[PDB]
Amino acid sequence: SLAAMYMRPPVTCYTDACEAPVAMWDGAIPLKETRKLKNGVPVRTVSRTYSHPPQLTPTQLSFNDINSMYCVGNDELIQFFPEGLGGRVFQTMPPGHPRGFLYRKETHLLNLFVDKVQHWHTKRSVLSSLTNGRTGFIVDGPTGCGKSALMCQVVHFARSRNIVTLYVPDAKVWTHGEWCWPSTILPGFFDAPDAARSFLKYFAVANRATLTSWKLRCTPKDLPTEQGERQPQNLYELCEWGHRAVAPASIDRQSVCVKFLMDELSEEKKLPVVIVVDGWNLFSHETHFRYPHPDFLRGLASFNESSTDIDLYPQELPRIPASRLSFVRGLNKMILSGDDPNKFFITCTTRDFKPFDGISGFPNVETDRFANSLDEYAPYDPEKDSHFHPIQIGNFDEYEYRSFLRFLINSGELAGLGWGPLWHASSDFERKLYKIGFLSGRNPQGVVDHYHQELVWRYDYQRTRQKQYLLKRRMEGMSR
Amino acid sequence: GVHRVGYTHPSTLPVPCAQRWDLRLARARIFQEYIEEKAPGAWQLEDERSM
Amino acid sequence: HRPVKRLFCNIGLMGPQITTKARWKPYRFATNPAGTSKAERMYQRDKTVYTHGHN
Amino acid sequence: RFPPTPSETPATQDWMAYTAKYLDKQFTISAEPAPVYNVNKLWPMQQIPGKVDQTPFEEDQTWLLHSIPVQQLEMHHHEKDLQDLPFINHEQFPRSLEWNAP
Amino acid sequence: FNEFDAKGREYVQYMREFARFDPRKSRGNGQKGFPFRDAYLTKMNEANQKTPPPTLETIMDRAVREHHQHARILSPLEVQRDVGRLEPIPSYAGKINADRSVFPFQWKTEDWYEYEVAKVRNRRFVFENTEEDGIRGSEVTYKIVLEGFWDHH
Amino acid sequence: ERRLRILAQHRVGMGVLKLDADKYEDQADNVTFGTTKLSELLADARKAQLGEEYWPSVELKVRKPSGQSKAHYSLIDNERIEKRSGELYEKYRDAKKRSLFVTPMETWLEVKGM
Amino acid sequence: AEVDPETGIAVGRGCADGEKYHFTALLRENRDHNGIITVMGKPLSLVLDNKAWLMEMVLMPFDEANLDYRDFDAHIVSEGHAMPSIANEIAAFALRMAVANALVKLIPLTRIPLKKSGLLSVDRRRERGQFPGYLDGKKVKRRFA
Amino acid sequence: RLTYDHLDQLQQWTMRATLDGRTEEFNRIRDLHREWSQHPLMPVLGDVEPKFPLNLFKQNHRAKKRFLVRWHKANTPANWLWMPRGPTVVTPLHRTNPTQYPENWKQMVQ
Amino acid sequence: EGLPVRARRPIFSSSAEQRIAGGPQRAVIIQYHHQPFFNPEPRLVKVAFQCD
Amino acid sequence: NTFLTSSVATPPISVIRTGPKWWAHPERMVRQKLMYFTLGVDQLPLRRTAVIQRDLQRFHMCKPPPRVGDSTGYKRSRAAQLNTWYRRIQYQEYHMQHLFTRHVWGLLRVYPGNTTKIQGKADDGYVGYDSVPFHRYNRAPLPFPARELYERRK
Amino acid sequence: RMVDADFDDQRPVSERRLFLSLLTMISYSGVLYTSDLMAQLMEMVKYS
Amino acid sequence: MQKLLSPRTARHARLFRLAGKLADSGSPGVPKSDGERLVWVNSHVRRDKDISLSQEEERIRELMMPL
Amino acid sequence: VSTGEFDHPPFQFRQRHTFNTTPLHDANRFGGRTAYLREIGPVNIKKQGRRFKKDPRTVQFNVDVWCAQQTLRKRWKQRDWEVIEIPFRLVPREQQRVIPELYTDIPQMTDPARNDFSNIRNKVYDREELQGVLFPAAGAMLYPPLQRVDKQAMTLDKYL
Amino acid sequence: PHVEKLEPWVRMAEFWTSSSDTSFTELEMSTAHYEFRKFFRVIICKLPFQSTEFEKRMYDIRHWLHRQTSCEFHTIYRRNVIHDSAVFPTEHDPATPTTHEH
Amino acid sequence: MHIFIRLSYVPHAGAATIARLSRRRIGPIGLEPHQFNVPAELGFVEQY
Amino acid sequence: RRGKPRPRAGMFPDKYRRVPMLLKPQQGGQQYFNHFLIRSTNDRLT
Numbered sequence A: 001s002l003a004a005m006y007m008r009p010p011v012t013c014y015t016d017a018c019e020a021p022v023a024m025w026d027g028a029i030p031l032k033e034t035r036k037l038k039n040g041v042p043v044r045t046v047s048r049t050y051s052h053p054p055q056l057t058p059t060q061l062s063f064n065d066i067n068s069m070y071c072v073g074n075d076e077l078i079q080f081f082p083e084g085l086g087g088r089v090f091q092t093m094p095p096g097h098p099r100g101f102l103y104r105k106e107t108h109l110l111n112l113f114v115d116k117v118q119h120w121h122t123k124r125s126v127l128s129s130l131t132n133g134r135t136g137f138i139v140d141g142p143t144g145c146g147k148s149a150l151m152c153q154v155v156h157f158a159r160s161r162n163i164v165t166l167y168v169p170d171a172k173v174w175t176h177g178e179w180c181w182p183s184t185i186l187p188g189f190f191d192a193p194d195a196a197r198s199f200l201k202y203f204a205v206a207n208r209a210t211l212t213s214w215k216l217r218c219t220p221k222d223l224p225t226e227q228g229e230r231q232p233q234n235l236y237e238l239c240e241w242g243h244r245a246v247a248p249a250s251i252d253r254q255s256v257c258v259k260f261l262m263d264e265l266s267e268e269k270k271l272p273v274v275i276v277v278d279g280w281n282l283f284s285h286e287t288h289f290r291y292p293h294p295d296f297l298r299g300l301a302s303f304n305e306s307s308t309d310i311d312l313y314p315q316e317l318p319r320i321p322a323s324r325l326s327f328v329r330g331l332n333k334m335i336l337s338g339d340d341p342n343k344f345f346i347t348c349t350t351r352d353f354k355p356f357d358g359i360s361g362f363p364n365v366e367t368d369r370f371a372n373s374l375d376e377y378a379p380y381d382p383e384k385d386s387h388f389h390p391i392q393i394g395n396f397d398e399y400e401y402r403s404f405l406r407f408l409i410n411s412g413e414l415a416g417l418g419w420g421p422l423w424h425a426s427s428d429f430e431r432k433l434y435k436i437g438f439l440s441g442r443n444p445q446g447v448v449d450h451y452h453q454e455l456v457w458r459y460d461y462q463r464t465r466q467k468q469y470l471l472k473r474r475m476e477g478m479s480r
Numbered sequence B: 001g002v003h004r005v006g007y008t009h010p011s012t013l014p015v016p017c018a019q020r021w022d023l024r025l026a027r028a029r030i031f032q033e034y035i036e037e038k039a040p041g042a043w044q045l046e047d048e049r050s051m
Numbered sequence C: 001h002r003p004v005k006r007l008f009c010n011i012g013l014m015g016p017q018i019t020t021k022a023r024w025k026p027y028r029f030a031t032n033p034a035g036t037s038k039a040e041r042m043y044q045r046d047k048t049v050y051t052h053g054h055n
Numbered sequence D: 001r002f003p004p005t006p007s008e009t010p011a012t013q014d015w016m017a018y019t020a021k022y023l024d025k026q027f028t029i030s031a032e033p034a035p036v037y038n039v040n041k042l043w044p045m046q047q048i049p050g051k052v053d054q055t056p057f058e059e060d061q062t063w064l065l066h067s068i069p070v071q072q073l074e075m076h077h078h079e080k081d082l083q084d085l086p087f088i089n090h091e092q093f094p095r096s097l098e099w100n101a102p
Numbered sequence E: 001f002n003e004f005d006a007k008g009r010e011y012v013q014y015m016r017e018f019a020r021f022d023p024r025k026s027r028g029n030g031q032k033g034f035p036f037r038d039a040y041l042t043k044m045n046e047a048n049q050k051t052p053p054p055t056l057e058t059i060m061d062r063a064v065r066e067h068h069q070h071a072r073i074l075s076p077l078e079v080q081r082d083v084g085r086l087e088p089i090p091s092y093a094g095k096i097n098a099d100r101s102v103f104p105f106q107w108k109t110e111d112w113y114e115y116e117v118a119k120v121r122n123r124r125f126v127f128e129n130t131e132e133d134g135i136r137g138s139e140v141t142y143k144i145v146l147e148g149f150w151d152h153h
Numbered sequence F: 001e002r003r004l005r006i007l008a009q010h011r012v013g014m015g016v017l018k019l020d021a022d023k024y025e026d027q028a029d030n031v032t033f034g035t036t037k038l039s040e041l042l043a044d045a046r047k048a049q050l051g052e053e054y055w056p057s058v059e060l061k062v063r064k065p066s067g068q069s070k071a072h073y074s075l076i077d078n079e080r081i082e083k084r085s086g087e088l089y090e091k092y093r094d095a096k097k098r099s100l101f102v103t104p105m106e107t108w109l110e111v112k113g114m
Numbered sequence G: 001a002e003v004d005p006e007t008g009i010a011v012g013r014g015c016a017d018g019e020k021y022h023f024t025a026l027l028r029e030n031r032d033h034n035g036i037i038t039v040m041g042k043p044l045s046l047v048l049d050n051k052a053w054l055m056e057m058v059l060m061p062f063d064e065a066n067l068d069y070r071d072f073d074a075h076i077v078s079e080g081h082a083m084p085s086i087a088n089e090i091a092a093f094a095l096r097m098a099v100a101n102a103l104v105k106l107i108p109l110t111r112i113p114l115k116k117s118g119l120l121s122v123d124r125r126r127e128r129g130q131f132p133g134y135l136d137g138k139k140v141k142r143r144f145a
Numbered sequence H: 001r002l003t004y005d006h007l008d009q010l011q012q013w014t015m016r017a018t019l020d021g022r023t024e025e026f027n028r029i030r031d032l033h034r035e036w037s038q039h040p041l042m043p044v045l046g047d048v049e050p051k052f053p054l055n056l057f058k059q060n061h062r063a064k065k066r067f068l069v070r071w072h073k074a075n076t077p078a079n080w081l082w083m084p085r086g087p088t089v090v091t092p093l094h095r096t097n098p099t100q101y102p103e104n105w106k107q108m109v110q
Numbered sequence I: 001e002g003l004p005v006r007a008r009r010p011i012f013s014s015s016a017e018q019r020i021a022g023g024p025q026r027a028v029i030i031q032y033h034h035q036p037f038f039n040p041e042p043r044l045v046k047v048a049f050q051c052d
Numbered sequence J: 001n002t003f004l005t006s007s008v009a010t011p012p013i014s015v016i017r018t019g020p021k022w023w024a025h026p027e028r029m030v031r032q033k034l035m036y037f038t039l040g041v042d043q044l045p046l047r048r049t050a051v052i053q054r055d056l057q058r059f060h061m062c063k064p065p066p067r068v069g070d071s072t073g074y075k076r077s078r079a080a081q082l083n084t085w086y087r088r089i090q091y092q093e094y095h096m097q098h099l100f101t102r103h104v105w106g107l108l109r110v111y112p113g114n115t116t117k118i119q120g121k122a123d124d125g126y127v128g129y130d131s132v133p134f135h136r137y138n139r140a141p142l143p144f145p146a147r148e149l150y151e152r153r154k
Numbered sequence K: 001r002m003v004d005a006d007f008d009d010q011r012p013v014s015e016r017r018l019f020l021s022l023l024t025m026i027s028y029s030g031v032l033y034t035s036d037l038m039a040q041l042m043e044m045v046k047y048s
Numbered sequence L: 001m002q003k004l005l006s007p008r009t010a011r012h013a014r015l016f017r018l019a020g021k022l023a024d025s026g027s028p029g030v031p032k033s034d035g036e037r038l039v040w041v042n043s044h045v046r047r048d049k050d051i052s053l054s055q056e057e058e059r060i061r062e063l064m065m066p067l
Numbered sequence M: 001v002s003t004g005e006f007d008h009p010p011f012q013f014r015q016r017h018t019f020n021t022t023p024l025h026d027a028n029r030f031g032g033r034t035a036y037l038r039e040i041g042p043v044n045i046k047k048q049g050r051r052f053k054k055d056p057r058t059v060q061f062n063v064d065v066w067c068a069q070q071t072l073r074k075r076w077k078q079r080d081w082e083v084i085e086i087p088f089r090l091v092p093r094e095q096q097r098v099i100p101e102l103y104t105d106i107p108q109m110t111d112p113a114r115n116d117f118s119n120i121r122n123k124v125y126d127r128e129e130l131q132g133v134l135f136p137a138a139g140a141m142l143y144p145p146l147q148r149v150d151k152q153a154m155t156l157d158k159y160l
Numbered sequence N: 001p002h003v004e005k006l007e008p009w010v011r012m013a014e015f016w017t018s019s020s021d022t023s024f025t026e027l028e029m030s031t032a033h034y035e036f037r038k039f040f041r042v043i044i045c046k047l048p049f050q051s052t053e054f055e056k057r058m059y060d061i062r063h064w065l066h067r068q069t070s071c072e073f074h075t076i077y078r079r080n081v082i083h084d085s086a087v088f089p090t091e092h093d094p095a096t097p098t099t100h101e102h
Numbered sequence O: 001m002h003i004f005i006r007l008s009y010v011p012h013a014g015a016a017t018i019a020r021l022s023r024r025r026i027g028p029i030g031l032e033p034h035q036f037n038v039p040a041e042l043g044f045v046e047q048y
Numbered sequence P: 001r002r003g004k005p006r007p008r009a010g011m012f013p014d015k016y017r018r019v020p021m022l023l024k025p026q027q028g029g030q031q032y033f034n035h036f037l038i039r040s041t042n043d044r045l046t
């Protein structure tokens, strides 16, 4: 066997170092003898029949890369995505497995759009025609498509080209967060401190280089500051001041900071700004929070006789619309009010909800798969519910699906997460790809799920039949 | 939520029609029915087992 | 437990988080006095009192 | 009949009215734009007009935190009580179960 | 009938009834007025009118087979898989148009529920005595329901 | 016809009104009761001939205001909100100079004592 | 081959658990090479709750016929006892039998591989009927002293 | 019993750890898996877990389950000699040290 | 097939919800399926009117 | 997590001998595979269990092979050896699952059921809100709050 | 066929060698060349 | 310069000509757009190369089967 | 199709917390509502325990009503719209017709003449188009007109 | 007249067989099922006219029905009913409308 | 068209009289303008 | 049972007496037979 003859090639990038020990994946990934004239004298070395997709920067991506795979380094992910990733997009890249992305056809279009945004001032007319006068793009499609992956790639493109980008990877933490607190200085407005504290910290470190050069245009110079801390004369220092406080003093610390940050950001008309908001459909309707009962802000002396029933029966009060949040107020103001031709919104419509069709019994507490997913049950239409130009994206075509499946199976088996020594216990690549197409319906979310469920397949006789044929041929050869 | 159900009179309407409550009262006149005043509006449940 | 759950329902600002995600101590554990600091308190209750497990 | 209806509140009909009355007292619009015609909040059920009543609960928590009792004694049906039990099925005549009366 | 088996004979009835269905004809009969459930509901479903075209890879494969390789991809119906003899090409080999609005049937849950409960409830709402010419249409109708202990009796 | 359909919810079906008179044991009396009730229902349904004030209203399911109209909620009294925000910030910082944590209940929200 | 000339739909019948599961399969070829399988008006994956070990045996008749699933549109109608979720091996077996019978009716020569692989064969096993003499009612007697 | 919400929380935690660069938990998990996940050597002829004697007049099911429970309680993972363990074993399937893991890719150059 | 029958010519009108009868004139039966699954109630017989 | 009742532990033989009902159930198997994949370690024991179990359930219906009868007993010894080897492989898989589940719960700050051990910060065993006023294994009383294995802030 | 897909062999004969072999073969043959054949040959020459 | 937007190889050019012919014929599903047809041909040749490498690796794997 | 369990498990021997077997009323089956039917601790059959919790019929009825409540709450979550009366003259053309009562006739279609095959009982109209008729005396349009996107427009999706 | 079918009335009576007055387990294990059956057939006649002669000839077949067989006669006949505004007029609604209290 | 309507439309009383003559449709008949003849149908079950 | 030893499994009838012989075991993989026969013919020719 071609096992001891193989030595690992020199490691150039993080992707090359994700190779499992040779003995484990020798069966899964066969090796072949490659001959070439190395410095005159020909040399014949054994090499793998498969290699990971090359890792290359977004500026190196081209038209020929459409419907192909490309990897991103671990250090690049750390410096580009401190806010996190999409809800279900990171589960395909465990720490050992290399981080890959599919350069979709829509990805190329958005890569070009971000490229124009780099210097939009020279091509304002070009971008206006692309957006058709709208303030950005909103991406909608069937549940489990690559809409969140598109947003992650967009943020990668923006940060690689050094454009200040406001990233909201999860809209659940804002609209359907843990608790909501009224705004400190904005009457009739609320905010979510749990999401705001993390958002400010991640946004600051994400755009540390860009925001450092920024200067405050509309910001009070006499804001409260504890001993040892310095008044923020820089936008990045303002962001740090927003979250560098001990609770409960941080609640109002972020409440004023988020409003001033939005106001200062809206007061910029030259530097391009890119906004990426995953799950924008949560920002256009009511939040799951409820307005407080009026008896809670009235004061009760004797509960037994106070003409109140808050402690008797629970009741439903109107829900807070997402437009009443301090964070969302800035975004709505930029979208509606004109005179802001440098803000570019790229938003997604998450459709991860608890299934419901007629009857709905109590889900099993253990086997539930949509338990963590939020539930709204409200039909959504981005064309009528958003000001951005709608982009309809469907499931993978078989070209993209084949590349996605090839990357998942082979890179995982090369990284040391596949069958490895048990390669003969799984069907061939074409048989697996054919089965996954039927099982998953060529759905990006279904592909990874059925790839994981591949081992539990019971009805697949190809390997047993192939073993039987090989044994029969070997016996005939021994007889001869 | 808790609310008081309004009743817009056809005379007060910009263009008069026949209100659903008026038609239901006519139905109760036609067939001798019983209007349960204390019937809650939040307990309208469909027997999904047999429906 | 009943009034605190009802007040959490009525206050809003939490939504379904008090039932879909929150959990509460059992019926006999939530009836302990203000300061207990001991598990065996529920068995120290008077037995000749016919209050049906209400201390 | 349960669930009991809690006492009404003035400005809990809509978020605009709630903000105008309980939050700032400076909100310009009194309430949401109300159509001149009648709006039936509980569409299937025709409730008595002028009567304060609730609507089926949107949230799950209130359903199990409300004062909703459970069945304790035997279940009584307005007509099936003649038939003693599911086991003791009292049939007056041996007619078909799919029989029609024209 | 030697054409189809029991289930096929039953189902071709529904197919023909939906083919000749007209909603204005249901005013007289009861359950008979209800058309084929699957076809009617999948027609009412608004998400089925958008039939996807043949996919890019299949189009390219058919092109490279018919034009470049001079051998078109035969549909499974017209493939002579009987090694014993040549079978004639059936009339439905490839001329049966495929549309998402007709087959396979996909319907909304609420539409299905409403159809089922309406069909159950509209049991006796049939005007037996009409002026239509033929078997249906009469002045008086008599039903003699004769009951005994034995089926042969 | 529409008024009659509204008046008779389940008694009509597929354009065929049906009334099962079961009041009396005698069919001779039951048919009399059925005819009387049918005539009464028809007379009460004929109100639509009198004028538009008896025409049954149409049940129309109007949608909640769409997201585009919802987004305008963030700009309600926008100039007044911006003007008030500066004063609220002044009060907030003045109270923060003396208290470690400041709540909106002492800045803008009002909670009556008793 | 027996099939309606007008629509080209082959009808097959499958049964499992005696009378608990009865399904009727309607099969038609798609000229567009786009093929979806539907059960009671819903996608097969949604019907079977995205269970690979159940959806594999529905595809198995096509693999044993050496055909392409994308060329056929299959609809499944459930008869007998209807349940909310039929994501169980017995119901999957019934669906497999119905699909195999429909494919056999559509294409005659497909009968040999399916019959030799046992796809068309019906198992007469069914759950033991209720009996109040048993403690649970099915298979366990009462306490003896 | 492990739930899908637990899986989602684990995915969020590992995403946070990867994005923050904390890899000590990953290294300790991988070392624990390397130590506990070795291929069991094939038992020699005559290796069979003992079975409880059978009697027909009166089968004591309580003793039947007691013997099994006690035997498996004694058969602790510590003394599982069949599963190779310790540093003397050679594992030609897993990386031996954290230095050669892909997170330390900066070292393997030229 | 080819059975001489005299059938009433139907008249097609959108104003009439139901079918319109007409003059009974000569016709030739092109085909008639006795199978109820090929022509359910009300069963039809395909005819050709020789006048036009 | 959601199961906080004191539980009874069945023998590993009793767990393994259950067929594709709980031990070999595809839903639980794929959940374990997902957990291993998210942790980034190879699923060799789980795959070695699955390859055995799918063949076992495939061949469960048929009859045992006819045998002439080995005088030396080599065939019976070989069959017993194979059965024991498969049982030990499944033992290793069971232990791997029951170890990594506890490790994941400890990492995720998930409070487990009564009378179970998490190698991180709870070695005696976790008892909280139990029907008995003591640990039931150390016979020591416990505070009214269950315990605080992890800090407060997340 | 020479440039439609990829050939698999125990000896991977190069595209240059196979194209030159075919060109010499058709040169040795006396076939009256056609526009499409020469166009295909020139297109193959276009990139190498 | 980056990469030229032209069919690089013989398969690329031939499938580009075929896509143009299909667009002229007006078959359903043909994108009849230049960039879309370029994406089509690039993806199809990529699929062909993937099939070729899978066929190359399967025969090497067959030699490594245990029995 | 729903993955939830609608059936109360039958009464049998005492269920112990283990693998494949959990207590019948361990705060997880049918949500937390099983506390209404939970009787913790060893209980004397002679003189302890409420019989309605031991009656299979009653507990099945209770779990049925709880499932019905779940279905109702989810349906009302879906029901984002509200119903407003209009006197048959300000409605669009698709509504100027006779609509049979619920569950009384064939499910009607929304004017199949112009290839519109929706369900008339499920069609929902937005407020923007009906703003004029709903608020005749409003004067200034309080709700802004709905800005429709032109499909014929040359946008980024059309491969500019 | 064409003859149609109808689902037979089948009723399964389940009862004990043992006479033991002590052993409830034996009584339950001795349970037996026996069912009563009543099969019906429906004859449909559609006369284009109402003739009393046919009714006379039809109602008088119960005399010569076969052994152990009964018959039911469903009659659906068109009947002219008179609707008049003299006793059921179409007037306006009352000046004071009736409420739920009535 | 008016001729067709005149020769094809029957009044309520005319239709009731025409059906009652030949088909023996039992039931009262009304000729006053305020009366209307509704040709409904009745269904009942007789068993002896 | 009734205070008696439980009979051995041989006395009980077949547990799978109600399934066809072709089901136990299934012979799936018929599509590969022609391919393997042609492969065998090709390699035998070589």
Ligand SMILES: Nc1ncnc2c1ncn2[C@@H]1O[C@H](COP(=O)(O)OP(=O)(O)OP(=O)(O)O)[C@@H](O)[C@H]1O
Binding pocket: A086, A087, A088, A089, A090, A091, A092, A100, A101, A102, A103, A104, A142, A143, A144, A145, A146, A147, A148, A149, A150, A349, A350, A351, A352, A353, A444, A445, A448
């Ligand atoms: N270009 C891509 N590169 C890598 N993975 C991708 C790509 N597109 C989609 N995926 C994968 O598809 C799956 C689902 O993608 P995604 O997270 O965008 O779903 P979604 O439609 O936004 O879901 P939800 O409704 O939960 O918000 C993930 O496993 C993700 O990794």
Ligand SMILES: [Mg+2]
Binding pocket: A086, A087, A088, A147, A148, A278, A350, A351
């Ligand atoms: Mg998403």
